[PDB]
């Protein structure tokens, strides 16, 4: 875990998530996908404590998929984010809390708008034009404050994202082995293979 | 806090200051520390503010239900027994230090309760951070066979000692007089010896001083 970013542009939400899984002094894997598709137009990236992350992601995934089958209907990104926040808000006062931070990128088909939510392990939800968890934010927020515009295209968003990854690769102490980038828009979720 | 209780001829009087603190900051300059458990049983509370209010309301509620059940006016010893068993059960974690007083068919009474659940009996008592300042006055001026007006004077003097000399106490003096055969009289702000002096200047700003970005009407209706 470690680096997860998110950028909402005019017509899409773009999520970037590091590929490294490190344990001790060994990088065990360099192709890890730190994300789950909750629904056709909703993607969730995650970072935090080992084990907790995937266990939580898949648990949320199962619940949203259950809802979809029951109602034959897709929950809005806002509704999914509120469900996720409440689960984390319960968790923090449990015997053993989930130590997982998430970004939820979705395209609301009723509003025809992209939406990005940042939720930490305490259950602190905020809707944002761009988001980050962990130490990444200390570089990317100021960078995006400068270069981000609300009316950008998906291509402009990807170039803006390349600028973030370059900065992180230059100044971050750890080798996070690049990122997997995914785009969420009106046509659903797709992965950029060459980044 | 500073709180006191003083017995007299035909009843009992309790008093309290009106300062509430958060560390060195005065949160409330005129809070009410005198609490009604039943019409003629009143409680002065020091310690954790929420705990004194919550424990006094709970027992007060149960005393009312008990009074209705038994078709009798409630007794001070019942409130005392219920408070102490509740506080003991929580091993001091409910930080309520109370002076319980009142009149009932048995007579007039004065007790104190500590957070861990121990109770005392006395003719004069004082609790809180300014209890030593108050008790110094009580030990100096108290006597057997006090009148009503003498006991009020002694009680308020003991509270004043706390107000002036204790940093955890200040502002005003509240009093409650519980006499046998009469209605209890709650004297809110019986003394107000700490009125703020006129300010040197009016800090009313010229309209338009504050820079505004947006305006909008908020909808409160359905």
């Amino acid at each position: 875990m470690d680096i997860i970013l998110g950028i909402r542009v005019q017509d899409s939400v773009i999520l970037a998530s590091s590929k490294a899984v490190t344990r001790g002094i060994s990088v065990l894997k360099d192709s890890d996908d730190k994300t789950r598709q909750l629904s056709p137009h909703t993607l969730m990236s995650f970072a935090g404590e080992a084990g907790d992350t995937v266990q939580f992601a898949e648990y949320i995934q199962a619940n949203i998929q259950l809802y979809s089958i029951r109602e034959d209907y897709e929950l809005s990104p806002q509704a999914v984010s509120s469900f996720v926040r409440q689960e984390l808000a319960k968790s923090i006062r449990s015997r053993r809390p989930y130590q997982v931070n998430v970004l939820i990128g979705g395209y609301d088909k009723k509003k025809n708008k992209p939406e990005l939510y940042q939720i930490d392990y305490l259950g602190t939800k905020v809707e944002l034009p761009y988001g980050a968890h962990g130490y990444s934010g200390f570089y990317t927020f100021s960078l995006l404050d400068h270069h981000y515009r609300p009316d950008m295209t998906t291509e402009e968003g990807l170039d803006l994202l390349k600028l973030c990854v370059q900065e992180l690769e230059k100044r971050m102490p750890m080798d996070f082995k690049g990122v997997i980038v995914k785009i969420v828009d009106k046509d659903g979720i797709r992965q950029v293979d060459d980044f | 806090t500073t709180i006191v209780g003083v017995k007299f001829n035909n009843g009992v009087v309790i008093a309290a200051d009106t300062r509430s603190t958060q560390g060195p900051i005065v949160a409330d300059k005129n809070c009410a520390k005198l609490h009604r458990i039943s019409p003629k049983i009143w409680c002065a509370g020091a310690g954790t503010a929420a705990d004194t209010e919550a424990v006094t309301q709970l027992i007060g509620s149960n005393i009312e239900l008990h009074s209705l059940y038994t078709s009798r006016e409630p007794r001070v010893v019942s409130a005392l027994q219920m408070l102490k068993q509740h506080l003991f059960k929580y091993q001091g974690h409910i930080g309520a230090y109370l002076i319980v007083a009142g009149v009932d068919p048995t007579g007039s009474h004065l007790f104190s309760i500590h957070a861990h659940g121990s109770t005392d009996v006395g003719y004069y008592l004082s609790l809180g951070s300014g209890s030593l300042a108050a008790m110094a006055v009580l030990e100096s001026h108290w006597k057997q066979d006090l009148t009503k007006e003498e006991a009020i004077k002694l009680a308020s003097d003991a509270i004043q000692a706390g107000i002036w000399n204790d940093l955890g106490s200040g502002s005003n003096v509240d009093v409650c007089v519980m006499e046998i055969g009469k209605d209890a009289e709650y004297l809110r702000n019986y003394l107000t010896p700490n009125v703020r002096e006129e300010k040197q200047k009016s800090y009313k700003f010229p309209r338009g001083t504050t820079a505004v970005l947006k305006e909008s009407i908020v909808n409160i209706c359905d």
Partner: protein, 212 residues
């Protein structure tokens, strides 16, 4: 604190904020974080205020004694090493300093030295130091080229502090700008973030996260 200084075609830019903090209490908004050692040497301050203020002033006295004894202005390397050797003697005692010794000499040219209280001493072209250093790096790195004009370099330095001033809770107040050339340092004014932010937001079109 956020302080930076970077080397480029036209010399050195040095930019700092002006906030001082005691926990979450904002102690000052008008603090001076650049100390003018001589007409060709500057020192930036980050970390303990007293530590920085006291020892960099002291550094200035040592640099003056050098030019009296040697009849020649002290090198940036030698000046930085006086400070680094001093704080190394105190290593472990609890001094807190992140400083940058920026200046020009004939033998060295424009030079920047990072010196901190653990005894680290590094020559380099770009450094950002302070609690908000990462926010400054984000903007500075992503816009930096060696061939920047004096006008563009001054703005980038100013804009990088503004970026950090905005995001970092323990940075802010105002931006102090300096430009170091072969002829010495030149002050380029105090710029209050209270006005600068809105001016930059409007003119540049940036800071879209903020309610306009």
């Amino acid at each position: 604190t956020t302080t930076l200084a970077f080397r480029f075609q036209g010399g050195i830019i040095v930019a700092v904020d002006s906030r001082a903090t005691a926990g979450n209490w904002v102690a000052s908004q008008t603090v001076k974080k650049v100390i003018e050692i001589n007409p060709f040497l500057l020192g930036t301050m980050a970390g303990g205020v007293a530590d920085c203020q006291f020892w960099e002033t002291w550094l200035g006295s040592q640099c003056r004694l050098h030019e009296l004894r040697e009849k020649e202005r002290i090198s940036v390397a030698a000046a930085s090493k006086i400070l680094s050797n001093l704080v190394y003697q105190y290593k472990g005692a609890g001094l807190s300093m992140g400083t940058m010794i920026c200046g020009y000499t004939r033998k060295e040219g424009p030079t920047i030295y990072y010196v901190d209280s653990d005894g680290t001493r590094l020559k380099g072209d770009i450094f950002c130091v302070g609690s908000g250093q990462t926010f400054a790096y984000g903007v500075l790195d992503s816009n930096y080229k060696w061939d920047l004009s004096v006008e563009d370099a001054l703005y980038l330095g100013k804009r990088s502090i503004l970026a950090a001033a905005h995001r970092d809770a323990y940075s802010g107040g105002s931006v102090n700008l300096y430009h170091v050339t072969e002829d010495g340092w030149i002050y380029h004014g105090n710029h209050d973030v209270g006005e600068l932010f809105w001016k930059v937001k409007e003119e540049e079109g940036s800071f879209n996260n903020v309610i306009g």
